[PDB]
Design a protein around this ligand. Structure first.
Ligand SMILES: CC#Cc1cncc(-c2cccc([C@@]3(C4CC4)NC(=N)N(C)C3=O)c2)c1
Length: 390
């Protein structure tokens, strides 16, 4: 590892998000910021909120610049309004540089901040195309690269603990690493395999084949990327398009048929519990996603275990049982490779070479019988036809 200063700079968990410490303004105001590859705005709480114990105070920053423009950002579940400005921004456990970046100062919000998440803002790491209000609002990473000598690349190691972390534990635990400008070899084992970034807006990729315990889901590959497939550190679940979700759940049910689970479990609503240490990992299948390779007609696969897709949760009765929720769910907006995928792998967002790399994570949870994997190459034809077009 050549980036010791950035290794282990993340905290949090899949259910509430992984965050990095940043500073905004002069003198520096410390805030915890959600690492989000699924959006492109740097937006921070800038007014009192019940779930915030701190926020950005523009009046206390001598370097604050008012852009005299508001922003209204409505999501599916949650929304926020803010005021656009610029200020000096740094990442203490990051590159040793300070940059002037756009900041959306959140003045009003609904279901945006998460009680107990320990973060006060979001760092949208995707491209300008999806920035709000429009693509003229330069994203943080674009500003960072343009103003410094930091290489146009970052890499994420999200570390699921494999068990529930209480309030105190989640604050004292290392949640992972965000390496700005490089690849740290201590965060992964084996080889890195790269898939092309199809288009620069979200981190869009193309899935060419899906298997459940080596059994091909056998769907037209276009279904897997309908209407897009993205890598999103800001989503908890592995989200699948409706038809893909229906086919995958049927196959996961069939593979795990020695034990029957209620519909609410498969719906990701209800947890399932087993006596301490008896989780029957072996009855649940592995899931492989084949991604388009960098070489013509070549693909590779990333394989996750139930230790990635079964999210550890504390039992309602805080008993000694090991409990989980099913962390694969349906989407009407394409595939979303969220923390379920990301926790299995070290993920390299190689913007300079328009590609995303995957390698087995040094912090993925597994058992003595199975491990997550990144393998290749495979001969795969007409992979371009797997990509969806409106
Ligand atoms: C892993 C993880 C996580 C996580 C947990 N709880 C809330 C959030 C959380 C909180 C606020 C906004 C967001 C968003 C919006 C677009 C900016 N980021 C994102 N990629 N997605 C799909 C969102 O809805 C996520 C993330």
């Amino acid at each position: 590892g050549s980036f010791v200063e950035m290794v282990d700079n993340l905290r949090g968990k899949s259910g509430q998000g992984y965050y990095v410490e940043m500073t905004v303004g002069s003198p520096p105001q410390t805030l915890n910021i959600l690492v989000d590859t699924g959006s492109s705005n740097f937006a921070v709480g800038a007014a009192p909120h019940p779930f915030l114990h701190r926020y950005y105070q523009r009046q206390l920053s001598s370097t604050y610049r008012d852009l005299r423009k508001g922003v209204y950002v409505p999501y599916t579940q949650g929304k926020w309004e803010g005021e656009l400005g610029t200020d000096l921004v740094s990442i203490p456990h990051g590159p040793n540089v300070t940059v002037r970046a756009n900041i959306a100062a959140i003045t009003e919000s609904d279901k945006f901040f998460i009680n107990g998440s320990n973060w006060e803002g979001i760092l949208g790491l995707a491209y300008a195309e999806i920035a709000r209000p429009d693509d003229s609002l330069e994203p943080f990473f674009d500003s960072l690269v343009k103003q410094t000598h930091v290489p146009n690349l970052f890499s994420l190691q999200l570390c699921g603990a494999g068990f529930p972390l209480n309030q105190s534990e989640v604050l004292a635990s290392v949640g992972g690493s965000m390496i700005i400008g490089g690849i740290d070899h201590s965060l992964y084992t084996g080889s890195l395999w790269y898939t092309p970034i199809r288009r620069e807006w979200y981190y869009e990729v193309i899935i060419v084949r899906v298997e459940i315990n080596g059994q091909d889901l056998k769907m037209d590959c276009k279904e897997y990327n309908y209407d897009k497939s993205i890598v999103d550190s800001g989503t908890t679940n592995l989200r699948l398009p409706k038809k893909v979700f229906e086919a995958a759940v049927k196959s996961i049910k069939a593979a795990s048929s020695t034990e029957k689970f209620p519909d609410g479990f498969w719906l990701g609503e209800q947890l399932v519990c087993w006596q301490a240490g008896t989780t029957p990992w072996n009855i649940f299948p592995v899931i492989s996603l084949y991604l388009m390779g960098e070489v013509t007609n070549q693909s590779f696969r990333i394989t996750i275990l139930p230790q990635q897709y079964l999210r550890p949760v504390e039992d309602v009765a805080t008993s000694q049982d090991d409990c989980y929720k099913f962390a694969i769910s349906q989407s009407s907006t394409g595939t979303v490779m969220g923390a379920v995928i990301m926790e299995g792998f070290y993920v390299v967002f190689d913007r300079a070479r328009k590609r995303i790399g995957f390698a087995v994570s040094a912090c993925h949870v597994h058992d003595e019988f199975r491990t997550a994997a990144v393998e290749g190459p495979f001969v795969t034809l007409d992979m371009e036809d797997c990509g969806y077009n409106i």
